[PDB]
Design an enzyme around this catalytic site. Structure first.
Site, short mmCIF file in Angstrom:
data_model
loop_
_atom_site.label_atom_id
_atom_site.label_comp_id
_atom_site.label_asym_id
_atom_site.label_seq_id
_atom_site.Cartn_x
_atom_site.Cartn_y
_atom_site.Cartn_z
N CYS B 65 0.84 -1.26 -0.08
CA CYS B 65 -0.07 0.00 -0.05
C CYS B 65 0.87 1.19 -0.04
O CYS B 65 1.48 1.56 0.87
CB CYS B 65 -0.97 0.14 1.12
SG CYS B 65 -2.05 1.62 1.25
N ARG B 68 -0.17 4.49 2.74
CA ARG B 68 -0.16 4.35 4.11
C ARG B 68 0.26 5.62 4.93
O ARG B 68 0.19 5.46 6.24
CB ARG B 68 0.98 3.39 4.66
CG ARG B 68 0.24 2.08 4.18
CD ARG B 68 1.54 1.06 4.54
NE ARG B 68 2.41 0.73 3.41
CZ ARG B 68 3.64 0.15 3.66
NH1 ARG B 68 4.08 -0.47 5.00
NH2 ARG B 68 4.43 0.18 2.40
N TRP B 237 -9.31 6.15 -1.13
CA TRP B 237 -9.76 6.63 -2.26
C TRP B 237 -9.01 6.07 -3.32
O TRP B 237 -7.90 5.26 -3.19
CB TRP B 237 -9.29 8.28 -2.31
CG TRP B 237 -8.45 8.59 -1.92
CD1 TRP B 237 -7.01 8.71 -2.40
CD2 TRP B 237 -8.23 9.11 -0.57
NE1 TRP B 237 -6.16 9.13 -1.64
CE2 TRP B 237 -6.84 9.66 -0.37
CE3 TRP B 237 -9.10 9.45 0.62
CZ2 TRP B 237 -6.47 10.05 0.95
CZ3 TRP B 237 -8.52 10.16 1.83
CH2 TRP B 237 -7.38 10.55 1.96
N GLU B 242 -4.84 3.16 -11.03
CA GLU B 242 -5.59 1.83 -10.75
C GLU B 242 -6.70 1.76 -11.58
O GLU B 242 -7.01 0.68 -12.09
CB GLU B 242 -6.10 1.88 -9.25
CG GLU B 242 -5.04 2.03 -8.23
CD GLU B 242 -5.87 1.68 -6.87
OE1 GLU B 242 -6.12 0.78 -6.72
OE2 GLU B 242 -6.03 2.49 -5.89
C1 HEM Z 1 -6.33 6.40 1.72
C2 HEM Z 1 -6.11 6.21 0.30
C3 HEM Z 1 -5.39 4.83 -0.12
C4 HEM Z 1 -4.77 4.87 -1.25
C5 HEM Z 1 -4.79 6.06 -2.50
C6 HEM Z 1 -4.22 3.60 -1.48
C7 HEM Z 1 -3.72 3.15 -2.64
C8 HEM Z 1 -3.36 1.60 -2.72
C9 HEM Z 1 -2.98 1.18 -3.88
C10 HEM Z 1 -2.66 1.73 -5.25
C11 HEM Z 1 -2.79 -0.15 -3.61
C12 HEM Z 1 -2.08 -1.21 -4.63
C13 HEM Z 1 -3.54 -1.82 -5.43
C14 HEM Z 1 -3.10 -2.45 -6.75
O1 HEM Z 1 -2.23 -1.82 -7.47
O2 HEM Z 1 -3.58 -3.48 -7.37
C15 HEM Z 1 -2.97 -0.49 -2.42
C16 HEM Z 1 -3.05 -1.66 -1.80
C17 HEM Z 1 -3.29 -1.99 -0.47
N1 HEM Z 1 -3.81 -1.07 0.35
FE1 HEM Z 1 -4.00 0.82 0.11
N2 HEM Z 1 -4.73 2.79 -0.28
C18 HEM Z 1 -5.27 3.80 0.46
C19 HEM Z 1 -5.94 3.38 1.59
C20 HEM Z 1 -5.92 1.85 2.28
C21 HEM Z 1 -6.55 1.53 3.25
C22 HEM Z 1 -7.79 2.66 4.04
C23 HEM Z 1 -6.45 0.43 3.78
C24 HEM Z 1 -6.84 -0.47 4.76
C25 HEM Z 1 -7.23 -0.10 5.86
C26 HEM Z 1 -5.27 0.02 2.65
C27 HEM Z 1 -5.00 -1.21 2.73
C28 HEM Z 1 -4.05 -1.77 1.36
C29 HEM Z 1 -4.08 -3.12 1.27
C30 HEM Z 1 -4.31 -4.29 2.07
C31 HEM Z 1 -3.46 -3.25 0.10
C32 HEM Z 1 -2.90 -4.79 -0.79
C33 HEM Z 1 -4.05 -5.44 -1.27
C34 HEM Z 1 -3.45 -6.57 -1.82
O3 HEM Z 1 -2.44 -7.20 -1.57
O4 HEM Z 1 -3.97 -6.98 -2.91
N3 HEM Z 1 -5.21 0.83 2.00
N4 HEM Z 1 -3.23 0.80 -1.72
N1 LIG Z 2 -1.47 -4.51 -9.07
C1 LIG Z 2 -1.13 -5.89 -9.14
N2 LIG Z 2 -2.07 -6.86 -9.04
C2 LIG Z 2 -3.06 -6.58 -9.21
C3 LIG Z 2 -3.81 -7.12 -10.52
C4 LIG Z 2 -4.99 -7.08 -10.90
C5 LIG Z 2 -6.07 -6.60 -9.66
C6 LIG Z 2 -5.49 -6.10 -8.60
O1 LIG Z 2 -6.42 -5.60 -7.80
C7 LIG Z 2 -6.10 -4.87 -6.54
C8 LIG Z 2 -7.45 -4.56 -5.78
O2 LIG Z 2 -7.90 -5.66 -5.09
C9 LIG Z 2 -6.99 -3.47 -4.68
C10 LIG Z 2 -6.45 -4.20 -3.58
C11 LIG Z 2 -6.37 -3.00 -2.53
C12 LIG Z 2 -6.13 -1.64 -2.72
C13 LIG Z 2 -6.83 -1.23 -4.06
N3 LIG Z 2 -6.87 0.22 -4.24
C14 LIG Z 2 -7.49 1.01 -3.39
N4 LIG Z 2 -7.23 2.40 -3.82
C15 LIG Z 2 -8.17 0.58 -2.00
C16 LIG Z 2 -9.10 -0.29 -1.90
C17 LIG Z 2 -9.76 -0.10 -0.54
C18 LIG Z 2 -8.77 0.54 0.17
S1 LIG Z 2 -7.64 1.45 -0.72
C19 LIG Z 2 -7.10 -2.01 -4.88
C20 LIG Z 2 -4.31 -6.18 -8.42
C21 LIG Z 2 0.42 -6.15 -9.59
C22 LIG Z 2 1.71 -5.38 -9.12
C23 LIG Z 2 2.79 -5.97 -9.56
C24 LIG Z 2 2.55 -7.30 -10.19
S2 LIG Z 2 0.78 -7.42 -10.15
CL LIG Z 3 -9.91 -1.57 -8.08
#
Ligand code: HEM
Ligand SMILES: N=C(Nc1cccc(OC[C@@H](O)c2cccc(NC(=N)c3cccs3)c2)c1)c1cccs1
Ligand SMILES: [Cl-]
Ligand code: HEM
Ligand SMILES: N=C(Nc1cccc(OC[C@@H](O)c2cccc(NC(=N)c3cccs3)c2)c1)c1cccs1
Ligand SMILES: [Cl-]
Lengths: 362, 362
Positions: B65, B68, B237, B242
């Protein structure tokens, strides 16, 4: 003692090598000769075939290289016979000439004598045979910052750059027994350069950008069957993003994005305008356009990734495990538009291979 | 037996938690109560403070994330009291409403009762609370392919989509003791959507693109001090990429680049034209422009990376080890223009944290 390590790598290499060359029967006797040669001399000498194939294998095993599809067409120049600095110089000059090939770049490696007692025979100081000097003093920042320390080392030895943004560094290397390296200015006729222009935006030429045609990495060690070729410069052609997204783009390199933004006529004030991203695309289009227009070989990152996909398919159907470094395989622009981004890779190190070694300066 | 594992995680959590809350003295007695509570009941119940702080810690420890920096302002809704499916539904509805906050998105998590015997109390089937359905039959490809199997599962249960490219999936979940999930259509008044338009290119609206305002991840397990909250949907947000570089761009998602290329009036025939790259930039500019114009919170990848740099600095000066996953931290467009690309990160897993768990369908 340490000799044991050489013998092991030797067994592993010859077996794999002759197996691939369809010479599996010749192994037992080739290994025997090697065994006694190590016993008597401490080392062993590769055949033409072993050396050529080993350099090819090494490229094939380079985890960070997206261009590996063409590993088997590597042009290997055997220069283990050099004994003099005039010979080394001329070998380096020749490599530049033949690799450049009037713009139709041949992937080539020149192999110099290997380390003896860990002791180098030839010690190349250049990071690439062709590279631009960099200067830094009193706020003044000229040329390529990546070259700042080598440039200062050269100027110790009586070299002096013009302090243009694109001074060609001299070839600089040291021979075993010499306390000091020698440097030789590059003949400008050997070095192709490409002016950066844009296909649509005529004002792009106001930036007066250029880059050299051929990247010739001259500071890595080729290791083949326990033998350490510290001096073994190699080249391919560029992937466009290496020039447009890094060399000319990075803040610690030429740092040209704000200037690009200006000539393409977009504001560089707001992150949400994605002006850096837009500048990157145009700069990268400019680079590909310019190389192709001059007739100098270059590949875009999409074509390169497609080629690498074929390398993946080729390795599987040949029964070879594939290895790769995802963090270097993805291109620095639009990486999610390539298949590489969406899969993962085993980053295991397989020999033969190219390795980092310590700089002799700084 | 297995109880031992709970106790260990409990000791580790309470110590770290109360230490951060400046309640270090209260630890010995809090742990004691927990020890006997585990002995008698097999588990233990978090205080309001422990639960809130644990969900915050979990976000802070999410290696993938980039958002953070704002971990400590997480809005934590405690819904461990739900016993009925009408209560669960209304809790989910409320989360959507309060998180959306008329476009000024509050990062929020709703926490439902945890697993008892590994046995879930509430089992959410949605991957995000708001997501589009996807259909696939006889060459026909409609909507979001990522949702193909959940969509088929919903239609088993008597739901039927309009087979528009943007059908909102119903909320769907199962209560302990029920053999079958229930589904509830989303009230359209709860769901903000944003039409995608371009600031300069008026024809961009011909693509008739849109996306939902708030991504609410509803299929991960929050683990806090040995307690397994499988049902604990959270939101932030979006970062623009994304939507623009993945959801709308990926070939296995909405696959809109060729169409984008057409409306922006560039050819999509040659790799060396970098038309995909150019399409990506305009699509991503379009997305940021559209969210900001509607007044729905969104961050660009450059601003996001700057914020994450502050998180890095903040962690160091607080004496906390930083952990991260470079492969998810870099944005999928212009990653080398962020500081993230040029450093590396320890991908160690620290608890509390959010984890994947198995889908109940397919
Ligand atoms: C406040 C605005 C936030 C932004 C802009 C943000 C941004 C992101 C982005 C871009 C990702 C990567 C998702 C992807 O590329 O597929 C991500 C992953 C993640 N974020 Fe955040 N995030 C935010 C808030 C949060 C919150 C509130 C939580 C939980 C309390 C959180 C927990 C996570 C987790 C667990 C992942 C990884 C999910 C996975 O492994 O698939 N984030 N975040
Ligand atoms: N981005 C990648 N994987 C991937 C592929 C398809 C969908 C996907 O969804 C993440 C989606 O489930 C997800 C998970 C956690 C956060 C977000 N985005 C947000 N802004 C938030 C949702 C809730 C709080 S923040 C979105 C992640 C890779 C990077 C490098 C190699 S593969
Ligand atoms: Cl999404
Ligand atoms: C034929 C055209 C070739 C192309 C287009 C190509 C492309 C690339 C690119 C883009 C990189 C990453 C560099 C970076 O991003 O900083 C790379 C790395 C590398 N390539 Fe290739 N390459 C080619 C040929 C070769 C050849 C001929 C060799 C050696 C025989 C080679 C060995 C390597 C090695 C060792 C690295 C990693 C260097 C390091 O770890 O720093 N490649 N290649
Ligand atoms: N690209 C990265 N690192 C990096 C940073 C600065 C310079 C640099 O130069 C590579 C340069 O020495 C080099 C090395 C090997 C090959 C090339 N490029 C070429 N086309 C060839 C040269 C010779 C044969 S192919 C260029 C690499 C990173 C990726 C992910 C995290 S950091
Ligand atoms: Cl380079």
């Amino acid at each position: 003692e340490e000799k044991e390590i050489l013998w092991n790598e030797a067994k592993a290499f010859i077996a794999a090598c002759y197996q691939e060359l369809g010479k599996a029967a010749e192994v037992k006797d080739r290994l025997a000769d090697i065994k006694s040669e190590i016993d008597l001399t401490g080392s062993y000498v590769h055949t033409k075939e072993e050396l050529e194939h080993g350099a090819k294998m090494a490229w094939r095993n380079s985890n960070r290289c997206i261009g590996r599809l063409f590993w088997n067409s590597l042009n290997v120049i055997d220069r283990r016979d050099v004994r003099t600095k005039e010979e080394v110089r001329d070998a380096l000059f020749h490599h530049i000439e033949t690799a450049t090939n009037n713009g139709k770049i041949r992937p080539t490696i020149t192999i110099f004598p290997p380390e003896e007692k860990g002791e180098k025979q030839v010690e190349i100081w250049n990071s690439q045979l062709i590279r631009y000097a960099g200067y830094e003093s009193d706020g003044e920042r000229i040329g390529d910052p990546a070259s700042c320390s080598l440039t200062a080392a050269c100027e110790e030895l009586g070299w002096r750059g013009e302090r243009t943004d694109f001074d060609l560094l001299p070839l600089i290397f040291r021979m075993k027994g010499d306390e000091q390296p020698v440097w030789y200015e590059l003949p400008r006729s050997l070095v192709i350069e490409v002016p950066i222009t844009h296909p649509d935006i005529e004002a792009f030429s106001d930036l007066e950008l250029k880059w050299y045609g051929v990247p010739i990495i001259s500071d890595m060690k080729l290791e083949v069957g326990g033998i350490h070729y510290n001096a073994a410069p190699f080249n391919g052609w560029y992937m466009g993003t290496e020039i447009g997204a890094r060399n000319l783009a990075d803040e610690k390199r030429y740092d040209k994005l704000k200037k690009v933004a200006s000539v393409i006529g977009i504001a560089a004030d707001y992150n949400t305008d994605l002006w850096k991203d837009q500048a990157l695309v145009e700069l990268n289009k400019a680079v590909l356009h310019s190389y192709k227009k001059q007739g100098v070989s270059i590949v875009d990152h999409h074509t390169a990734a497609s080629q690498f996909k074929r390398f993946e398919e080729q390795a599987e159907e040949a029964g070879r495990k594939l290895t790769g470094d995802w963090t270097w395989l993805i291109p620095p622009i639009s990486p999610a538009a390539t298949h590489i981004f969406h899969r993962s890779y085993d980053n295991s190190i397989v020999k033969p291979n190219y390795f980092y070694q310590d700089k002799p300066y700084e």
